[PDB]
């Protein structure tokens, strides 16, 4: 019930760009718990502290054979994305104009 999962995630679809603002990433979990959390947080080039507002209530997951949707908010220019306890670092970049 309270778990940020210790697992490895991956995007299985190209992040859409709904101009409404949101960049909808969508990932699948390779790990063990059952209904846990996404260390979903964004940031700059180091864990340069935060530059990014997540717009997902409290996104989670239930089993291994399904995908986990996400929709976040990115003010623009140069910036980064992340997912994961470090084992299996999700260092994704994102540009915007």
């Amino acid at each position, epitope marked *: 019930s309270y778990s940020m999962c210790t697992g*490895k995630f*991956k*995007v*299985v*679809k*190209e992040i859409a760009e709904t101009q409404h603002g949101t960049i909808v990433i969508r990932v*699948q979990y*390779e790990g063990d718990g059952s209904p846990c959390k996404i260390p979903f947080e964004i940031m700059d080039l180091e864990k340069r502290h935060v530059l990014g507002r997540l717009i997902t209530v409290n996104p989670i997951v239930t089993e291994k*054979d*399904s*995908p986990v949707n996400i929709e976040a908010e990115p003010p623009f220019g140069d910036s980064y994305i992340i997912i994961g306890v470090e084992p*299996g*670092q999700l*260092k*994704l*970049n*994102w540009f915007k104009k």
Partner: antibody
Amino acid sequence: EVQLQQSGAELVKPGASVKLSCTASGFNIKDTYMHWVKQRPEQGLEWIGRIDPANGYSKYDPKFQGKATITADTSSNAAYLQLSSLTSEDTAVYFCARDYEGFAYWGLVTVSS
Amino acid sequence: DIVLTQSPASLAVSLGQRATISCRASESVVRYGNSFMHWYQQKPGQPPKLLIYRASSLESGIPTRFSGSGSRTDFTLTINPVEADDVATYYCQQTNVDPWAFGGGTKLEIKR
């Protein structure tokens, strides 16, 4: 668990059609991408294309077009495909996959007289 | 158009040695920081099981025998503890550019 399952086998007169079928068992096809690879006697692999169930869009390897045309649907079943004005070389196996970032789980056609 | 080039069109390694395969791409294949590289393993009349993505991977729990390596589009993989299931043509892939292809691959052979 999750089982992408292609249809047994089939054969056809040269210059005809076929319609393979990749029946996914545990995930809603919509969820991701689905592929179609090709493989013959010794030849390694050649990518025939991918399809995104949700928005029907789909891109292929250029010279494979005129031939096949991938298509699964927004509804209740599996991801299909079919080649045309078939030759002899195309006489060979086909596979389907699903995961963007590494085909994790995947799924023989002959041209004769 | 795009390209990759699995050099060793074939090779054979002793039973206890270090095997190593190094793919290579035309002029580019980089996307979102990590490369969406992909590595596989296929055996006659059987289903090509997958084993790698982005050069930092695990999938379908392969007791770590086979791991990744490399990053601008110049690459190179490895399978140190070589064994029996080990005979197959590992194929080099790429999910960055849209005419997603695989490569020439390579045949493994052991030393009895």
